[PDB]
Amino acid sequence: GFCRCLCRRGVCRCICTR
Numbered sequence: 001g002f003c004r005c006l007c008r009r010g011v012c013r014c015i016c017t018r
Contacts, residue, residue, distance in 0.1 A: 001017055001018045003015070003016040
């Protein structure tokens, strides 16, 4: 559904999510 840098306030996760 979305493949970008999922940056959360404390942890950044750049992955590929449906």
